[PDB]
């Protein structure tokens, strides 16, 4: 699918104690490329992958300044929301923000988004048209009236249609050899007995990128999806991902089951079996 640039902000109040902490991470597709964390002294926006390191000092200065000012805004925001909900000043709360753009075939914004959450729940979000907001509750409706009167949606739209996509197309170039390379998973099937009438067959997918993948089991061409164990896709540690799908079968029917792996890194979808 289409490439995307996205940022994820987490602000956490520390009462008090008596300030916040603010963390930002930036991704291109499933690859983290920058981070900011004012838990560190003299905080700076910093590179998290080789290909971004080549940005000049002015970029890093501008990004740093920008996020530090954003951190201040979220510090104030936490105080404001505590007020909206008439909550105790002694408790810590979270304000999360999620925004990004997707690149279309014409090199323009395919679609963009901006979503915010308070204490882990939807608070306010920009609608698909990038021109109106959806408030989750009465408190968010106060924020909404402020953002409507302030032209926040129009600034967001211009960013998403402008700087966001422009930056994305740039990063995609800089990190060509890695961002635009599909890394197929290395696969195999393992067997793990249990009692006499149970045997776990596990289909592995290792070191793949991007994150999107399909692992399914079939019993003579019939899907076995409902008794299948599917783990959450997990980071390999090197920028790639891992995943596996297991299912218990009769200790003799091993040959009667097939694992099917679909990943854009493959030439053809795979069909694995236990040997």
């Amino acid at each position: 699918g289409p490439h995307s640039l996205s940022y994820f902000y987490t602000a956490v109040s520390r009462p008090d104690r008596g300030d916040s902490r603010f963390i930002a991470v930036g991704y291109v597709d499933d690859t983290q490329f920058v981070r900011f964390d004012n838990y560190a002294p003299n905080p700076r926006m910093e590179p998290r992958v080789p290909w971004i390191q080549q940005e000049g000092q002015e970029y890093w200065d501008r990004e740093t300044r920008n996020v530090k000012e954003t951190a201040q805004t979220y510090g104030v925001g936490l105080n404001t929301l505590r007020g909206y909900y008439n909550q105790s000043e002694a408790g810590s709360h979270t304000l999360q923000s999620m925004y990004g753009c997707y690149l279309g075939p014409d090199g323009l914004l395919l679609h963009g988004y901006r979503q915010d959450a308070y204490d882990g729940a939807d608070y306010i979000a920009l609608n698909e048209d990038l021109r109106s907001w959806t408030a989750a509750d009465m408190a968010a409706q106060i924020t909404k009236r402020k953002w409507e009167a302030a032209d926040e949606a129009e600034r967001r739209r211009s960013y998403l249609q402008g700087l966001c996509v422009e930056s994305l197309r740039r990063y995609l170039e800089m990190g060509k050899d890695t961002l635009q390379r599909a890394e197929p998973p290395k696969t195999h099937v393992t067997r793990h007995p249990s009692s006499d009438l149970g045997v776990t067959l596990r289909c592995w997918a290792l070191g793949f990128y991007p994150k999107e993948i399909s692992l399914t089991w079939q019993r003579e061409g019939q899907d076995q999806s409902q008794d299948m164990e599917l783990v959450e896709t997990r980071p390999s540690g090197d920028g790639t991902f891992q995943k596996w799908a297991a299912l218990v079968v009769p200790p003799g029917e091993e040959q009667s089951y097939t694992c099917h792996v679909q990943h854009e890194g493959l030439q053809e979808p795979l069909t694995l079996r236990w040997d």
Binding site: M45, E63, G77
Partner: peptide, 9 residues
């Protein structure tokens, strides 16, 4: 590149 600070909540 990051967006500028959002409006106040």
């Amino acid at each position: 590149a990051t967006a500028a600070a959002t409006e106040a909540y």
